[PDB]
Amino acid sequence: VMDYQTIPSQGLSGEICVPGDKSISHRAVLLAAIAEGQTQVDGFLMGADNLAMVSALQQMGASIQVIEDENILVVEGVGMTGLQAPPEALDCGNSGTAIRLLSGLLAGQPFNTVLTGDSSLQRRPMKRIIDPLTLMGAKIDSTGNVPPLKIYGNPRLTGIHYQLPMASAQVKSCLLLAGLYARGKTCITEPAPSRDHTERLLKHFHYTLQKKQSICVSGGGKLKANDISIPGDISSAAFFIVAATITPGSAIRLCRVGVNPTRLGVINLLKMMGADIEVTHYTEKNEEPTADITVRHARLKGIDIPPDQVPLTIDEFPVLLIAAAVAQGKTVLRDAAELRVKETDRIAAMVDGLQKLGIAAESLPDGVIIQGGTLEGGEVNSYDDHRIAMAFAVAGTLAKGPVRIRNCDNVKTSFPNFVELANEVGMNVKGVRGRG
Ligand SMILES: [K+]
């Protein structure tokens, strides 16, 4: 078992490219697997979650060559009906995304599948997908609406018109995938817009989409192979953006980062707090916009986080709360109860760690109240959550003393080369032997 140990930073500098987007990587390889023809995937995130998605597809006879050192996949698609019944339960590891997407993919197959994963994954809520999939005629056994899930494939799924009562957590993507195999059209309508990585990829693979506040697909179409280049993960960049923001003497450039508007919340909010962040060299390679992000040290003020930014920033709140901890004044986060049902309860985790580092932090059922202050050295627990681990690694840049973050083995689920890149820009992090 291993921990991260930090010492304060004298300032970040240089230019780095963060690894590929986790969310786009999952969808890219899944769609490529069932496409017709050969898809080359560049920038695939070679992390534990995305490789679990790869292994899972391979158990069902996807043809995927992994070239790990180059972040490349070469996928020979097996076509829409080309998958084969896997012999054992599919282990999604730590990956909520993989299990929810596979559920959509597998609901309409002519075979049965069991989906499971690690302890954390077996606590992630699935009611949100089970219910709509069932409306389409899926049959999914589960206890307490958490994995493991047993899917009894139904090749005669029916399109539904569904209005999700919540900015989807892969619910839209899940139903869209099921929609490809359903008879008729499947229409998903949502209160507020959410991530659209799936829609962009469906278009990329030439599957017809329509189109106003809702989105529809009709089943029985074909996915057509089309090479894809995956942008840097802005959720991964977020750690360095906060680090360069709060560490005096810092100036860095993050190259080739995805800047999808539905993912830009951390930038939007930091700027509101007074951050110094410039987006340049904006380009549009296939489907996903990417840009370079230049960050310089800046003093921050606490803010009331606007409710409309919450969906745009949900995954960056761990590291954003570090910025709040060192800002001048109070920060209030509301409407973010979804933080409690992630890999760990992220509100409880962040509040626990912040208090251990000398920050006045207070939990709400749907968020947190932070009084900006001074980070001390100390020791915190990652709660096995990659973003909690990395958030406190970022805390270490400004903490008065060393920060020990226990149990960081799961950082590689989303950011395999985190330690290397951190030390490269001047964020001091070392992996050391942990306990237990
Ligand atoms: K995960």
Swiss-Prot record:
It comes from the Bacteria. It catalyses: 3-phosphoshikimate + phosphoenolpyruvate = 5-O-(1-carboxyvinyl)-3-phosphoshikimate + phosphate. Disulfide bonds: none annotated. One of its GO terms (biological process) is aromatic amino acid family biosynthetic process. GO terms for molecular function: 3-phosphoshikimate 1-carboxyvinyltransferase activity. Pathway: Metabolic intermediate biosynthesis; chorismate biosynthesis; chorismate from D-erythrose 4-phosphate and phosphoenolpyruvate: step 6/7. InterPro entries: Enolpyruvate_Tfrase_dom, Enolpyruvate_Tfrase_sf, EPSP_synthase, EPSP_synthase_CS, RNA3'P_cycl/enolpyr_Trfase_a/b. Its EC number is 2.5.1.19. Keywords: Amino-acid biosynthesis, Aromatic amino acid biosynthesis, Cytoplasm, Transferase. Phosphoenolpyruvate binds at residues 22, 96-97, 124, 170, 346, 387. GO terms for cellular component: cytoplasm. Residues 94-97 are annotated as: Phosphoenolpyruvate. It is found in: Cytoplasm. 3-phosphoshikimate binds at residues 23, 27, 168-170, 315, 342. Its main location: cytoplasm. The active site is at 315 (proton acceptor). Homodimer or homotetramer. Belongs to the EPSP synthase family. HAMAP family: EPSP_synth. Catalyzes the transfer of the enolpyruvyl moiety of phosphoenolpyruvate (PEP) to the 5-hydroxyl of shikimate-3-phosphate (S3P) to produce enolpyruvyl shikimate-3-phosphate and inorganic phosphate. This is 3-phosphoshikimate 1-carboxyvinyltransferase. The lineage of its organism: Bacteria, Pseudomonadati, Pseudomonadota, Gammaproteobacteria, Legionellales.
